[PDB]
């Protein structure tokens, strides 16, 4: 016998479950987050800038339109030597982000400086010839 909730994750609750299980509701969480007068006016502009900031990076990385996209940057096991299953079936999003917090800027840089650079250079060369 199994008791069930209604439809899907309410809000953020999956943050403490494994990243594997949590991935199920990225569509939910993303939609919810993505979407006196002067103070609110300021807040609105800030919300837009935060919104567009993320969209800029997703655009550049070739990830726009996706909530899950594979890159072409290899994982340097110096960051973490855990296997695929040792991470995804054993660690939460809150825990994972902390584990590699100090590599965020490194990897983000690598995506753009190496892969994006390559994809744009080679793209033109392929279109030319």
């Amino acid at each position, epitope marked *: 016998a*199994v*008791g*069930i*909730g209604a*439809v899907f994750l309410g809000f953020l609750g999956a943050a403490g479950s494994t990243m594997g*299980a949590a991935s*199920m*509701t990225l569509t939910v969480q993303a939609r919810q987050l993505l979407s006196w007068g002067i103070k609110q006016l300021q807040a609105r502009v800030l919300a837009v800038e935060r919104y567009l900031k993320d969209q800029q990076l997703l655009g550049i990385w070739g990830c726009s339109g996706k909530l899950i996209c594979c890159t072409a940057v290899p994982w340097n096991t110096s960051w973490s030597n855990k296997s695929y299953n040792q991470i995804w079936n054993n660690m939460t999003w809150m825990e994972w982000e902390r584990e590699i917090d100090n590599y965020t800027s490194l990897i983000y840089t690598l995506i753009e400086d190496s892969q994006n650079q390559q994809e744009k250079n080679e793209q033109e060369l392929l279109e030319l010839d």
Partner: antibody, heavy 132, light 108 residues
Framework: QVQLVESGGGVVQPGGSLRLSCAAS????????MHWVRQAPGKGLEWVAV?????????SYSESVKGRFAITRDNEKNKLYLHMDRLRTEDTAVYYC????????????????????????WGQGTTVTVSS | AIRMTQSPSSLSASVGDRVTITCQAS??????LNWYRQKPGKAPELLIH???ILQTGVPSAFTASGSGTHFSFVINKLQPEDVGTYFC?????????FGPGTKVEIKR
């Protein structure tokens, strides 16, 4: 070790009320789902209700008790409660608290669900008499 | 949960005999069956779960089998210590219905 201390019973009149409180230790009370069952004198064991683990985001009641009883829990006191309201003489029974084999809020299909496989841990209950 | 029935309501044998309890569902419950044993003054003891697997710490004095609608509980040898009421519980749906219970005792 595992021990359930089940009290709060006694004798009440029909139309009255009481609340039972089953204190427990020796296990992760906060995590496992729990059961209520009762056995009237001369009868077999009747299932009363179930509450899931964690904060108890799901319940089910026997049709014989729905609307008259409520289940809750306090994960810091490690106590399981049965709110026995608007009682009838038919509610005379020894009531037991029990732990399900699992009862956990699994994240599956994008939602939490509680998997139950039946009671496997309990105390000896306490007698609640409703009479006049 | 599907209503369970047990038979005979009164089952007895001499000490050491092989004693079985019939239990059936009116509808297919596939496997969701627990066996409990109640002794006077004690809450029912879980002996077998998932229709065939002994609970940890329970001696191999009992077996059970069947699936679908037809199940049985087997007492390999009935000892005075095994006297009690055995219950057939279904937990397929969130009603966890108990069967009537069968009383097993020693002939005299």
């Amino acid at each position: 070790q595992v021990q359930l201390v089940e009290s709060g019973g006694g004798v009440v009149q029909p139309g009255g009320s009481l609340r039972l409180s089953c204190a427990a230790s020796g296990f992760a009370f906060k995590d496992f789902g729990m059961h209520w069952v009762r056995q009237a004198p001369g009868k077999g064991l009747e299932w009363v209700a179930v509450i899931g683990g964690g904060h108890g985001q799901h319940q089910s009641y026997s049709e014989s008790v729905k609307g008259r009883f409520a289940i809750t829990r306090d994960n810091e006191k490690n106590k399981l409660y049965l709110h026995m309201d608007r009682l009838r003489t038919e509610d005379t029974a020894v009531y037991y608290c029990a732990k399900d084999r699992l009862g956990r809020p699994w994240n599956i299909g994008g939602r939490l669900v509680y998997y139950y496989y039946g009671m496997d841990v309990w105390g000896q209950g306490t007698t609640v008499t409703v009479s006049s | 949960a599907i209503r369970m029935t047990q038979s005979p309501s009164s089952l007895s044998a001499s000490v050491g005999d092989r004693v079985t309890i019939t239990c059936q569902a009116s509808q297919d419950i596939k496997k969701s069956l627990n066996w409990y044993r109640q002794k006077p003054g004690k809450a029912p003891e879980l002996l077998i779960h998932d229709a065939s697997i002994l609970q940890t710490g329970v001696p191999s004095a009992f077996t059970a089998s069947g699936s679908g609608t037809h199940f049985s509980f087997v007492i390999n040898k009935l000892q005075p210590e095994d006297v009690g009421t055995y219950f057939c519980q279904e937990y397929e749906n969130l009603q966890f219905t108990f069967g009537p219970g069968t009383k097993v005792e020693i002939k005299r």
